[PDB]
Design an enzyme around this catalytic site. Structure first.
Site, short mmCIF file in Angstrom:
data_model
loop_
_atom_site.label_atom_id
_atom_site.label_comp_id
_atom_site.label_asym_id
_atom_site.label_seq_id
_atom_site.Cartn_x
_atom_site.Cartn_y
_atom_site.Cartn_z
N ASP A 59 -2.40 10.08 -1.83
CA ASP A 59 -3.24 9.83 -0.67
C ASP A 59 -2.56 9.00 0.42
O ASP A 59 -3.12 8.02 0.91
CB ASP A 59 -4.54 9.15 -1.13
CG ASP A 59 -5.61 9.13 -0.05
OD1 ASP A 59 -5.67 10.09 0.75
OD2 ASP A 59 -6.39 8.15 -0.01
N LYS A 91 -1.31 7.69 3.90
CA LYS A 91 -1.87 7.69 5.24
C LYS A 91 -1.53 6.38 5.94
O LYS A 91 -1.13 5.41 5.30
CB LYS A 91 -3.38 7.90 5.19
CG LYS A 91 -4.12 6.98 4.27
CD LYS A 91 -5.57 7.43 4.12
CE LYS A 91 -6.30 6.57 3.12
NZ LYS A 91 -7.72 7.00 2.94
N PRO A 92 -1.67 6.35 7.27
CA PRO A 92 -1.38 5.15 8.05
C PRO A 92 -2.04 3.90 7.51
O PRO A 92 -1.41 2.84 7.47
CB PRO A 92 -1.88 5.52 9.44
CG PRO A 92 -1.58 6.99 9.50
CD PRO A 92 -2.06 7.47 8.15
N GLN A 93 -3.30 4.00 7.08
CA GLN A 93 -4.04 2.85 6.56
C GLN A 93 -3.44 2.23 5.30
O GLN A 93 -3.61 1.03 5.09
CB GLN A 93 -5.50 3.20 6.30
CG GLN A 93 -6.20 3.80 7.50
CD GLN A 93 -6.19 5.32 7.48
OE1 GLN A 93 -7.14 5.95 6.99
NE2 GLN A 93 -5.12 5.92 7.99
N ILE A 143 -10.50 -7.81 3.42
CA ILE A 143 -9.47 -7.05 4.12
C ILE A 143 -9.98 -5.65 4.43
O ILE A 143 -9.57 -5.04 5.41
CB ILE A 143 -8.20 -6.94 3.26
CG1 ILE A 143 -7.49 -8.29 3.22
CG2 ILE A 143 -7.29 -5.87 3.81
CD1 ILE A 143 -6.28 -8.30 2.31
N1 D31 Z 1 -5.90 -1.30 6.09
C1 D31 Z 1 -6.92 -1.67 5.09
C2 D31 Z 1 -7.69 -0.46 4.55
C3 D31 Z 1 -6.72 0.50 3.84
C4 D31 Z 1 -6.14 -0.05 2.54
N2 D31 Z 1 -7.22 -0.52 1.65
C5 D31 Z 1 -7.14 -0.30 0.19
C6 D31 Z 1 -5.96 -1.00 -0.45
O1 D31 Z 1 -5.57 -0.69 -1.58
N3 D31 Z 1 -5.37 -1.99 0.21
C7 D31 Z 1 -4.32 -2.84 -0.22
C8 D31 Z 1 -3.62 -2.73 -1.52
C9 D31 Z 1 -2.49 -3.63 -1.80
C10 D31 Z 1 -2.09 -4.63 -0.80
C11 D31 Z 1 -2.79 -4.73 0.48
C12 D31 Z 1 -3.91 -3.83 0.78
C13 D31 Z 1 -4.39 -4.05 2.14
O2 D31 Z 1 -5.33 -3.50 2.69
C14 D31 Z 1 -3.53 -5.09 2.68
C15 D31 Z 1 -2.58 -5.52 1.68
N4 D31 Z 1 -1.70 -6.50 2.18
N5 D31 Z 1 -2.17 -6.68 3.61
C16 D31 Z 1 -3.26 -5.82 3.90
C17 D31 Z 1 -3.97 -5.77 5.24
C18 D31 Z 1 -3.65 -6.89 6.23
C19 D31 Z 1 -4.55 -6.88 7.46
C20 D31 Z 1 -4.53 -5.51 8.13
C21 D31 Z 1 -4.96 -4.40 7.15
C22 D31 Z 1 -4.06 -4.40 5.91
C23 D31 Z 1 -8.19 -1.46 2.25
C24 D31 Z 1 -8.76 -0.91 3.55
#
Ligand code: D31
Length: 276
Positions: free
Chosen positions: A120, A122-124, A10
């Protein structure tokens, strides 16, 4: 774990890598975060699986094996950054912007009431689903764009007000379709904030000149008109935003107080139109 099979990466967080995986047992798809392991920290994280909220990504399980730490979170289908990029053409509808802001303030209010901050935002790390919900995730080249000024100035013991600042920056970005303070270095970040909100002094921020990284030599910029900063946000929105972007952490509006702001008078829960 022997019970989870990775589907795809991801992405990369700051506390390790995140993978989309399927639980060979329940058959469920989750977000797997891979991080001896400090015991003080173990008790800490064990406390996260405890604070559950409709607007906080659920931490399903915490696996600690072979000095390795795996955090299993619920899987959401998109993050705010992606949704915003996909909406760059016309922008996210105000009702939906107002709904996401409200939900995030709710999650924050809950977090802060338990003396837990994100640090922290943020949009991400803002996750959304087809239902119209948005959740806080990934609690505390890394972006500095949403970093509060007291953090940039070296305050070691900052408060929950830092999350309000970050959310304020995200709120403005959703409305203008452009990062509010896109700095590429701590000092650049700091000066971009100074150029827009004006260089803080003892008048608007008592004690600011006694901050660790404060320099008596910082340039003195004048505060810019807010109507020029966030158009076409209405007066209620801009009023709320200015209160979320106050320099003085103690003057900055709280999440709980923000929920009672007139801006949310007509808040609803629109359903997002997203492509997965
Ligand atoms: N958008 C992804 C970046 C920012 C967040 N991180 C770090 C992180 O701690 N992520 C998560 C923690 C708990 C649950 C989830 C995630 C995470 O990244 C994510 C989760 N559930 N769905 C998603 C993605 C689905 C596809 C598009 C990007 C998000 C990975 C890179």
């Amino acid at each position: 774990m022997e019970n989870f099979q990775k589907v795809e990466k991801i992405g990369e967080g700051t506390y390790g890598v995140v993978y989309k995986a399927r639980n060979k047992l329940t058959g469920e798809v989750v977000a797997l975060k891979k991080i001896g392991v400090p015991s003080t920290a173990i008790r800490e994280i064990s406390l996260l699986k405890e604070l559950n909220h409709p607007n906080i990504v659920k931490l399903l399980d915490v696996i600690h094996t072979e000095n390795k730490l795996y955090l299993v979170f619920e899987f959401l289908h998109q993050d705010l950054k992606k949704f915003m990029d996909a909406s760059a053409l016309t922008g996210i509808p105000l009702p939906l912007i107002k709904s996401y802001l409200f939900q995030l303030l709710q999650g924050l209010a809950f977090c802060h009431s338990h003396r837990v901050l994100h640090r922290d935002l943020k949009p991400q790390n803002l996750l959304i689903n087809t239902e119209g919900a948005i959740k806080l995730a990934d609690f505390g080249v890394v972006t500095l764009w949403y970093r509060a000024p007291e953090i940039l100035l070296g305050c070691k013991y900052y408060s929950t007000a830092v999350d309000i600042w970050s959310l304020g920056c995200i709120f403005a970005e959703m409305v203008t379709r452009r990062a509010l303070f896109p700095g590429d270095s701590e000092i650049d970040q700091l000066f971009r904030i100074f150029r827009t909100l004006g260089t803080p002094d003892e008048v608007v921020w008592p004690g600011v000149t006694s901050m660790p990284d404060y320099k008596p030599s910082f340039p003195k910029w004048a505060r810019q008109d807010f109507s020029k900063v966030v158009p076409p946000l209405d007066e209620d929105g801009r009023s709320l935003l200015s209160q979320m972007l106050h320099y003085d952490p103690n003057k900055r509006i709280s999440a709980k107080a923000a929920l009672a702001h007139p801006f949310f008078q007509d808040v609803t829960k629109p359903v997002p139109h997203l492509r997965l």
